[PDB]
């Protein structure tokens, strides 16, 4: 979908503002026109990438860079906190394609701009990614994830710090990757939807799920720091941070939130349940015929592997927070299948105090 | 200046007591009945370390420019889920006004503002209870002059009530806007002038584009002024 002369000037001005490392105005341009009339100033993909990379340099480990970029800080905020807000705002816009909103063309021009960005994970202007591969120290998101075996360390490195009882580790997965990983998964889960109805192997299948050898390794990778039985001593190698200094706290920054362990478990299990649902997105698409060839997924006994790690747990708090979901409708079609799976495994292996929750969920789903 | 914001929450939040209250709620929400710990909304607030038995910014007392004090805060979603139990839709007005004022004061301070979820659900759900004209008529109790540093913030949280927020402040209405541009440039109140610019620009009164005769003035007034020129150039090139 090509742009018009109205959007070409916007794209060129944005890229020229980014060329001068004036990211404050790049954010203000998009922010100062959100809740106005129906125009929908859409971000170009060469700027969506800069936003994805700006969202990574959080204030917890990079205070001097942020404080030296824009001294005044008129918004009393940071670039990472703002960039994430804009990403979330435009993503929630993208998930609502209505004609009673901004436009039926700008929406389609955004849908193309967000899909031209996740594909890397317009010959009318010189985008500022030709001559720039570093945003204030952080390299990029499409260059740091297209490295050998780096998209999988980015997932296995945030799934183990989501329950951490340490300050820099938990912070990193709370302020950078937990938020960012829910965005990405939210984009692949609609790009895949704009691949099945426009096809006559999917974006979800290749380069996302095939990082990925067996069906049990997936179940051992989803829960990476839970209190399960741990039957495989050969666990994941000690994961290294994506960016240098991510696992370090700066002396000047002082955190102020007191996150109870229940809160950390809730957020962690929410992210893990989201990942499991994204996995089930395409495994329920394979018909009763042959199985897929690319991911080598069975789609019938991978439920057994996950429902085995749930029954063979050791904490009752974490076992509730998995099934005690807030969206009893957004995540259907695989929680009741993981309820009958866990219930039909403690009864067969014990002929405790967990089979009550599964019955409660099975009854709750009776509408 | 540094960290000179409103700072409603003065002391530390009663962690252990809050944690206790945090339990018995997950299964409760999945399947208030428990109100014996804190009976009233004042008790719920003081449990957050909100205030030493206080709801209005006393600017004569310099309440709008406080200090850091390095105080801890409970997760904001938990705060707004606990506060929304003492709602009492079908109740008197003298208690609902206190509820609304407590919500507004504990949405404008830096602690709750710089420690918020990327996706806002509770903030928009709480505001949707009251009336927009009532939320802005029983406005955030800041004086009309310094209404703009905190009005920029209120519009950063809720951006849809900007046209519905300059009416109550200015009451076409552009004559008042242009007159209030003066007495800010007549004085040296540039900061409040900057936030006045950031608050009014983009509305039905001061739209974007090359076309307002502020640029000329600034060009004539010439370190906090530069930012005004840059923002004005940016808004003209839209």
From Swiss-Prot, chain A:
Function of the molecule: Acts in a DNA repair pathway for removal of UV-induced DNA damage that is distinct from classical nucleotide excision repair and in repair of ionizing radiation damage. Functions in homologous recombination repair of DNA double strand breaks and in recovery of stalled replication forks.
> Which key words tag this protein in UniProt?
Chromosome, DNA damage, DNA recombination, DNA repair, Nucleus
InterPro entries the record matches: DNA_repair_Nse5/Nse6
KW rRNA processing (keyword) present = no
What name is this protein filed under? Non-structural maintenance of chromosome element 5
Q: Name one GO biological process term.
A: chromatin looping
**What else does UniProt say about it?**
Present with 907 molecules/cell in log phase SD medium.
Subunit info here reads: Component of the Smc5-Smc6 complex which consists of KRE29, MMS21, NSE1, NSE3, NSE4, NSE5, SMC5 and SMC6. Interacts with KRE29.
The places in or outside the cell where this protein is found are: Nucleus; Chromosome
Q: Name one GO molecular function term.
A: ATPase inhibitor activity
| Cellular component GO terms held in the UniProt record | chromosome, telomeric region; nucleus; Smc5-Smc6 complex
Swiss-Prot record, chain B:
Q: Primary place of residence?
A: nucleus
Q: Name one GO molecular function term.
A: ATPase inhibitor activity
Is the Nucleus keyword given for this protein?
yes
Q: Out of the domains of life, which is the source?
A: Eukaryota
Q: Does the keyword Protein biosynthesis apply?
A: no
GO biological process terms, alphabetically, are: chromatin looping; DNA repair; double-strand break repair via homologous recombination; regulation of telomere maintenance
Q: Provide this UniProt record's keywords sorted from A to Z.
A: Cytoplasm, DNA damage, DNA recombination, DNA repair, Nucleus, Phosphoprotein
GO cellular component annotations of the record: chromosome, telomeric region; cytoplasm; nucleus; Smc5-Smc6 complex
Where are its TM segments located? none
Subcellular location(s) per record? Nucleus; Cytoplasm
Subunit organization:
Component of the Smc5-Smc6 complex which consists of KRE29, MMS21, NSE1, NSE3, NSE4, NSE5, SMC5 and SMC6. Interacts with NSE5.
**Protein role:** Acts in a DNA repair pathway for removal of UV-induced DNA damage that is distinct from classical nucleotide excision repair and in repair of ionizing radiation damage. Functions in homologous recombination repair of DNA double strand breaks and in recovery of stalled replication forks.
Name the chain's protein.
DNA repair protein KRE29
The organism is Saccharomyces cerevisiae (strain ATCC 204508 / S288c)
The gene from which this protein is expressed is: KRE29
């Amino acid at each position: 979908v090509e742009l018009t002369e109205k959007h070409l000037l916007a794209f060129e001005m944005l890229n020229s503002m980014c060329l001068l490392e004036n990211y404050d105005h790049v954010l203000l341009f998009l922010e100062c026109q959100f809740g106005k009339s129906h125009n929908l100033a859409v971000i170009p993909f060469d700027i969506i990438l800069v936003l994805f990379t700006l969202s990574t340099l959080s204030e917890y480990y990079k205070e001097p860079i942020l404080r030296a970029n824009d001294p005044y800080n008129t918004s009393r905020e940071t670039l990472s906190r703002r960039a994430l807000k804009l990403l979330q705002k435009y993503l929630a816009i993208l998930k609502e394609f209505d004609s009673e909103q901004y436009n039926l063309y700008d929406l389609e021009l955004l849908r193309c701009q967000f899909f031209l960005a996740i594909d890397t994970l317009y010959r009318s202007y010189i985008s500022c990614l030709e001559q720039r591969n570093t945003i204030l120290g952080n390299r990029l998101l499409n260059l740091k994830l297209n490295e050998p075996g780096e998209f999988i360390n980015m997932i296995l490195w945030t799934l183990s710090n989501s329950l951490q009882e340490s300050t820099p580790l938990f912070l990193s997965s709370h302020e950078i990757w937990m938020p960012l990983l829910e965005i990405l998964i939210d984009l692949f889960s609609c790009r895949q939807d704009y691949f099945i109805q426009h096809e006559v192997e999917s974006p979800l299948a290749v380069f996302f799920e095939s990082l990925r050898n067996f069906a049990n390794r997936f179940s051992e990778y989803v829960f990476l720091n839970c209190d399960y039985k741990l039957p495989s001593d050969n666990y994941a190698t000690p994961v290294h941070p994506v960016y240098n200094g991510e696992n370090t706290i700066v002396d000047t920054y002082i955190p102020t939130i007191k996150c109870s362990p229940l809160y950390k478990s809730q957020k962690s299990l929410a992210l893990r349940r989201k990942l499991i649902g994204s996995c089930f997105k395409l495994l329920l698409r394979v018909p009763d015929g042959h199985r897929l060839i690319t991911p080598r997924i069975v789609a019938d006994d991978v439920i057994q592997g996950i429902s085995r790690t749930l029954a063979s747990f050791n904490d009752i708090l974490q076992f509730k927070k998995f099934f005690m979901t807030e969206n009893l409708s957004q995540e259907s079609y695989f929680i009741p299948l993981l309820a009958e799976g866990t219930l039909s495994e403690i009864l067969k292996d014990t002929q405790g105090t967990e089979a009550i929750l599964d019955a409660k969920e099975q009854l709750e789903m009776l509408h | 200046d540094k960290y000179k914001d409103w700072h409603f929450i003065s002391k530390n939040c009663h962690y252990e007591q809050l944690m206790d209250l945090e339990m018995k709620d997950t299964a409760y929400s999945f399947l208030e009945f428990v109100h014996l710990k804190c009976p009233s909304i004042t008790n719920l607030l003081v449990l957050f370390g909100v205030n030493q038995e206080k709801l209005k910014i006393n600017y004569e007392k310099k309440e709008n420019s406080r200090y850091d004090n390095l105080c801890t805060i409970f997760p904001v979603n938990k705060m707004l889920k606990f506060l929304m139990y003492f709602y009492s839709d079908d109740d008197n007005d003298d208690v609902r006004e206190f509820f609304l004022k407590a919500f507004i004061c504990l949405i404008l301070d830096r602690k709750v503002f710089n420690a918020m979820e990327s996706d806002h659900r509770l903030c928009f759900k709480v505001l949707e209870l009251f009336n927009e004209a009532h939320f802005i008529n029983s406005y955030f109790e800041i004086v009309d002059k310094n209404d703009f540093f905190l009005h920029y913030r209120l519009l950063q949280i809720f951006p849809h009530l900007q046209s519905a927020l300059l009416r109550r402040r200015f009451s076409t209405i552009q004559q008042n806007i242009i007159k209030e541009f003066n007495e800010f440039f007549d004085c040296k109140n540039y900061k409040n002038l900057l936030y006045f610019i950031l608050t009014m620009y983009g509305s039905k009164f001061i739209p974007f584009g090359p076309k307002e005769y502020f640029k000329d003035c600034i060009l004539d007034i010439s370190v906090e002024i530069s930012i005004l020129k840059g923002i004005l150039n940016l808004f003209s090139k839209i």
